Design a protein around this nucleic acid. Structure first.
Lengths: 317, 317, 317
RNA sequence: AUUGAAAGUUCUGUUUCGAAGAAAACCCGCCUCAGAUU
DNA sequence: CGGGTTTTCCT
């Protein structure tokens, strides 16, 4: 598994939208529970959903897969991740629906040999014999850091006009500025492995041949998420992003680093990693840290400089 | 016995679901009675059921048991905890049904020598001669703390879309933020001990040999629950969790610590533990405390740092 | 005598159940008559029966009696309180049935020297010469407080599923939250004393020797009820309990404190206790109060902190 | 002080044991607060 | 302006 926590600083941003009222376009907001010296309070803060990040990741994965020669589905070749949900998609791609429970494994292998996206990002088919496949990359909402007593975020509305020589043309757009945080998880030990229980079916040899390439592509795809190629309204509201802190852990057992809420979340996660490897009888535990804000790190930890170095190191091992 | 009270802080969460209405996925809610300065009131608040936690605990126990060589049932090798309820499971596993009341102990031992899950988590078989085994781990609903006059919890709905080039695609998801509390109990003095009354039956020597490993594995399995690996919808709604306060008590007599609703529940439970050991003629009483919010603790109390240290200490003693 | 009134606050609870309909398990409910400013009304409210409390008390008594060396019956050693009702129990234990009326005292003493449970909780034998022994501890149904115009209680239904890989598994459970109240009475002056009139029978000397230990054990057994170890479905629906108010009175004459329905029920019972001792020519009247909700108490009343102190004080006197 | 006067249908018992609403999905594609003044 | 929840279980 590869687990990570990342902290970003974003200014003058509008990357996720919600239903509009009047001539105003609104930014997504959510309630958060925060702890101050006086107790616990409830606040409303701008957020960014995780499905936009999932879409960006899967689009980059499609690009890399088509570049490197891996198979890509017909519908997903165009950036429409309906996958194989409805029967219309099955008809377009040309895959017979499963007949019974015993036939499920064949259908899963057939779908899994045509589109890498269905293999990595999971899918669901509903019918007489529904077939499920959980995603191999897990994301979450992007929240500003709940540090201290004051939330380091702000939201406002802005005024815009459309010029016309014959007036008979005014709209408002919400803009936010915050210090976002988020964490991610990716289990590369289950890529290119069937999930439905059953007997062996012809075609798994090709999967075993392509396993290494699929894992390499899946690990490569994370560069988009770690770089900042996500969100909408990028044509006229291009944001100003800057990485601040990053922790990545590679292990052989389940593990979850601390959220990027406290100023000291790198020392704690490394100590916890050592103790967890000791207690769970693991055999591999490595840590990589990127720091640009000069906070406490610890001892005996590899320190990197950019994200390309981290991607290369993750690929090599 | 091992009895514990734990306090968590969760933000932007959807971990337990219930039946859906329209295009809206709903979060579990329950009524709670709360005391304010003006009297008593009834409120509707999001909660998380205990059966999700039980499933997470049993899945982790399956993983550890397979890793350490302890026997695991065939159906329970797959993460499907029907245990030995119906006749189909008995036919699959290959165990003869009990004949009379006198044969109940043999059936319990045979079931108990094949699946550790049936041993630790209890089971039921209904028929001509019913057989019961109560669970050795007990859990409860996860509730936000009912401190003060305002409940520190909030629930809202969010708007999501599925993109398509040929419109002919909209759903809503309920998201919560709360300060959750829950308590648990695990009696390790009865693990690998038959429950049905009767005579001695061949095969108990193997259970006596495996008792130590079974107890060790059961104690290890709590790390998943104390870490935060439970609940659904984790692929796109990965939650942000953080521990705040934990009290764990090891005794030789029945005891129940205070619920984590009042800010002073560590001092009270320690005083009660001392007096209860005095009054019930016990011979062992230990307490461990993890504090990360700076609330009153007391004197002469072991203070830990993480949960791995607690797990190691519980294993060693 | 020892007479008490106790107020509890329970949330997300399912402790007593009744017949099931379909896939729904129901909670016991009863009608109550309540007085409001508009007159008198009838309502349906969840309750907890008294026999569950009696079972919990007797189980704790069995545990303590076995620990302290007092005799315990063969059938009651396993938690099955058939006592000595039917002839099969007599045959299993090995006690001859009474012959005539004059032999009743012999049978009562013989049964009373073998099981402390029969002595404290009473018993009944039906036959040619019926034998009765009234219980020495008296309990009642657990009702929520009937204060004001609104009953502080709520009941709802919850949805649960069982997972399976081959659909062919859905149930509902009723869950309640309320402010319960209950009162109890225990006359320790009749413990280890035969009740059937007759002549002296050999074996009463042993009862006189064991009277002190039997009284001590009977008083100690109240800790379970005052702590909260009762009810079913504790494996997955562990409740969140918290004491709020308790009044316990020790007297030499019959007396009954006020029910815990009004906010002022501690001052009233103390005034009534003083006047009743004045009028009935008593010689002992002590009161103990546990207060955690800041209601009116009075003057010249012993104030405790926990329940263990109360149990110790009851034992010492 | 009345077809009245005298009468406990009373004692003893858990509705218990076990079971993830779970898997898949961008609200997004275009728009100037602009012209005149010590 | 187009688009507004899909199955498989109900002791």
């Amino acid at each position: 598994m590869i687990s990570g926590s990342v902290r970003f600083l974003v200014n003058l941003e509008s990357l996720n939208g919600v239903e509009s009222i009047g001539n105003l376009t609104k930014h997504r907001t959510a309630p958060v529970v925060l702890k101050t010296s006086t107790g616990y309070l409830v606040r409303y803060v701008p957020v960014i959903s995780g499905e936009a990040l999932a879409h960006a990741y899967q689009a980059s994965l499609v690009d890399i897969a088509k570049k490197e020669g891996l198979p890509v589905g017909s519908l997903s070749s165009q950036y429409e991740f309906i996958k194989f949900s409805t029967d219309e998609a099955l008809k377009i791609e040309g895959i017979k629906e499963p007949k019974d429970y015993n036939d499920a494994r064949r259908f899963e292998v057939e779908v899994m040999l045509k589109d890498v996206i269905a293999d990595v990002g999971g899918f669901m088919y509903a019918g007489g014999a529904p077939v499920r496949r959980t995603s191999r990359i897990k994301l979450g909402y992007m929240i500003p850091a709940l540090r201290g007593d004051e939330i380091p975020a702000q939201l406002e509305a802005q005024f815009h006009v459309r010029f016309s020589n014959k007036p008979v043309a005014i709209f408002n757009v919400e803009v936010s500025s915050a210090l976002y945080t988020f964490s991610f998880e990716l289990d590369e030990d289950l890529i290119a492995v069937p999930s439905t229980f059953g007997e062996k079916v012809k075609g798994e040899e090709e999967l075993e041949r392509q396993k290494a390439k699929r894992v390499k592509s899946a690990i490569k795809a994370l560069y988009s998420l770690l770089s900042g190629n996500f969100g909408g309204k990028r044509s006229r509201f291009l944001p100003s992003m800057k990485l601040m802190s990053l922790v990545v852990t590679k292990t052989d057992f389940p593990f979850m680093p601390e959220p990027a809420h406290d100023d000291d979340y790198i020392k704690t996660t490394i100590m916890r990693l050592g103790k967890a490897k000791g207690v769970l009888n693991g055999n591999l535990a490595k840590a990589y840290v990127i720091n640009n804000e000069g906070i406490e790190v610890g001892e005996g930890v590899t320190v990197l400089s950019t994200v390309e170095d981290l991607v290369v190191k993750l690929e090599e091992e």
